[PDB]
Nucleic acid binder design. Structure first.
Lengths: 43, 43, 43, 43
DNA sequence: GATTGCATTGAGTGCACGG
DNA sequence: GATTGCATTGAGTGCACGG
């Protein structure tokens, strides 16, 4: 059910990822997953 | 300075990552980066 | 930064947790974390 | 039939789990269960 | 830039060859 | 019902003693 993948991100977008996941106590993989879902929704 | 990140995503979330990316004419890294900056906005 | 804890939940709330985390490709620990955060916010 | 679940939470998210729980006069399991049913609502 | 195999440590990540 | 130590496998969970 889980697949790996390597992405490239802006040194500033990644630094932001950090903070966000941190306050939400999430992993980047989870924060990303949350954000992806989120976005999908708002679409 | 751009940096790389190896993450793990749920097949279903990945599948939809692809879908959304195609339709937005962006790469996964790009899509993810959008959604990420988006969530930060939505608050 | 991470701490363990054992909770007790309704057979129906847990069954729901399942679905939700599943579609969001999240762990319960993550889904719960998301939901907790969420709630905090709406407060 | 009620069931048990051992989860892992980020200290900061746990700390705020406690805060919110106290103030709502509920147990963590209870709080978590609320928030969980809540998110499902918010959609 | 991207995909992946090798590797490790509490799946999610790093690293680097091969593209 | 809750906390925790023991245990395992891709931290997040199960299991069960002790409460």
């Amino acid at each position: 059910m889980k697949k790996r993948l390597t992405i490239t991100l802006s040194e500033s977008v990644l630094e932001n990822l950090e903070k966000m996941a941190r306050e939400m106590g999430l992993s980047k993989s989870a924060m990303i997953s949350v954000a992806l879902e989120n976005y999908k929704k708002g679409q």
